[PDB]
């Protein structure tokens, strides 16, 4: 997350062309969108230089379906974190509950910066990878 | 061996019972579509030329 052109291909937004003939403001043409459902576009998504094809604000994905909440338990991956959701399962014979949990891998854009123990709210997208089906949309801790 | 010979101008056809193996030996080592002269297989078919269109072997 220190340079933009690290990889072998040229990272650029698709079908967003800055004309070398003209010379105007807005140094690179940066396309962005609001994901909806009251989710705020971060300012560093508008002002940033990362590309991230799978970003919910600057990339080619959409948020629809479930909205989940979790606590980040692993973050050392490249643009992916692993969160944990905890809940109680109810046994009706003993008339009482037990603690269960699920680990969800979720893709993280450079617009957010999260650590271990952060609470994040995520939204469901199309399959990003083998296991990633969600994308983090709002960080609400420190 | 049997020779199913057809004349397409008149559209007629007849099988010939042929014996005396060195008469039909001239048909050997020839391909389908190659033409063959008539007097080598028989002086009754002299002057004629035929085209090999195929056939059936044993079984």
């Amino acid at each position: 997350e220190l340079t933009v052109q690290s990889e072998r291909a040229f990272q650029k937004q698709p079908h967003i062309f800055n004309n070398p003939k003209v010379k105007t403001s807005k140094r690179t043409k940066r396309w962005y969108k609001n994901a909806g459902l009251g989710f705020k576009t971060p300012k560093t998504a508008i002002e940033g230089s990362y590309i991230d094809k799978k970003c919910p604000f600057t990339g080619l994905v959409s948020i629809r379906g479930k909205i989940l909440t979790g606590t980040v338990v692993s973050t050392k991956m490249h643009r992916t974190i692993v969160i944990r959701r905890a809940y109680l399962h109810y046994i009706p014979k003993y008339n009482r509950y037990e603690k269960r949990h699920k680990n969800v891998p979720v893709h993280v854009s450079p617009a957010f910066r999260v650590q271990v123990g952060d609470i994040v709210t995520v939204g469901q997208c199309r399959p990003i990878s083998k296991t990633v089906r969600f994308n983090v949309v709002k960080v609400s801790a420190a | 061996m049997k020779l199913n010979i057809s004349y397409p101008v008149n559209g007629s056809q007849k099988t010939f019972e042929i014996d005396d193996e060195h008469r039909i030996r001239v048909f050997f080592d020839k391909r389908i579509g190659q033409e063959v002269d008539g007097e080598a297989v028989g002086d009754e078919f002299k002057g004629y030329v035929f085209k090999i269109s195929g056939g059936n072997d044993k079984q």
Binding site: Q5, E7, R8, A9, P20, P105, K130, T131 | -
Partner: protein, 187 residues
């Protein structure tokens, strides 16, 4: 044949999956095209729902777009010099999407002379009216005009020859151009 289903891989925890089902047809895959250059040969593939798909082998020419001029011309392909995915893919002179390639550049300078009247490298009043009307636009950039003096341009293939059958691309301009020449100059 080539399968595309996720039931044959391991689980996220690392466990083996058992054989639950035979290979269904709707999860099939096919062999790569490996499109070379010269002496065009497109075959047809019958796909799901009909929907014929063009597998291109050994394509020769293609439609390349000049984005800053907003035009596009049918130009031939000389050869691939850089590929971000594999260097053997360069070595076998194969054409895929996003392959850096050299084009012939003659009809582009024909159009430039017809539209602007200036020459690269180094009559009627309607033509003078067009050229005076199209002033302050023959100042494209130094890199592409020096490429024009060289006689070949660097273009990036923007089409998939495997699925579409065409080899279409666009001429490199600006920051992306400089990045690819910085990559291919490394020796």
């Amino acid at each position: 044949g080539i399968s595309r289903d996720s039931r044959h891989k391991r689980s996220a925890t690392g466990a083996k999956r058992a054989q639950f089902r035979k290979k269904r047809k709707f999860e099939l895959g096919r062999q790569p095209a490996n499109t070379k250059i010269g002496a065009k040969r497109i075959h047809s593939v019958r796909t799901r729902g009909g929907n014929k798909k063009y597998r291109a082998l050994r394509i020769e020419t293609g439609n390349f777009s000049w984005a800053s001029e907003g035009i596009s011309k049918k130009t031939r392909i000389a050869g691939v010099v850089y590929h971000p995915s594999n260097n053997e893919l360069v070595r076998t002179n194969t054409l895929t999407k996003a392959a850096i390639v050299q084009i012939d550049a003659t009809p582009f300078r024909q159009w430039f002379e017809a539209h602007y009247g200036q020459t690269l490298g180094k009559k009627s009043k309607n033509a003078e009216r067009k050229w005076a009307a199209r002033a302050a636009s023959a100042k494209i950039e130094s890199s592409v005009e020096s490429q024009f003096s060289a006689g070949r341009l660097y273009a990036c293939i923007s089409s998939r020859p495997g699925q579409s059958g065409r080899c279409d691309g666009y001429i490199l301009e600006g920051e992306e151009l400089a990045f690819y020449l910085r990559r291919l100059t490394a020796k």
